[PDB]
Each structure stands twice: as C-alpha cells, then as structure tokens.
Design a protein around this nucleic acid. Sequence first.
DNA 1: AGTTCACGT
DNA 2: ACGTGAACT
Length: 79
Amino acid sequence: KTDTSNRLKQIMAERNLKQVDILNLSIPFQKKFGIKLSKSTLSQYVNSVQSPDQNRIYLLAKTLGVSEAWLMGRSHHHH
DNA sequence: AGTTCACGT
DNA sequence: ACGTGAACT
C-alpha cells in the first residue's frame, strides 16, 4: 500500500535480509545518531500499517545504504 | 521472529 | 498520527 513498504521488501528480497537482520544492522547507526528503532515499528513499516517519520527514514537510509528519497519513492531503481 | 494494540507524545 | 513495549502467536 505504501512506498516504504515496497522499498523495504525490495531490499529484503535482493539482499536476503529478514526484518531482524535489517534491525541488527541499524543498531550501530542507532547509537550513533541517537535514533532508536524497535522491531514492532519496523514490522508496521513492512506491512503498510504505518510510515516512518523524519528521524527513522534517515536511520534506515544509512543502514541500508540507500537515499532517503529512494526509500520514500515509488521508483524501483537504485542510485 | 514477527504481529497487535493501548497508551503517550 | 507517530513510536514503543506488553503480550501475543
């Protein structure tokens, strides 16, 4: 339903990462930027229950090595 | 490991 | 409307 949900699922499929896998990779970035992230929050992202806010869109962009705009976009193409 | 929801913001 | 942990499967 949401763009973020489709962008996360795309990364999960391409890099064979589970939710817990992406969650663990964000941990060093969480302590660094002071932006916490629980597993229930990530779960709602993937399932279009809720969209990430300003701080967590940045957090996930750094973790997955993608741009904030791509993570918020409809586009399928990396850059 | 992943999901739902009352609650605080 | 957003994140979170309790409680859940």
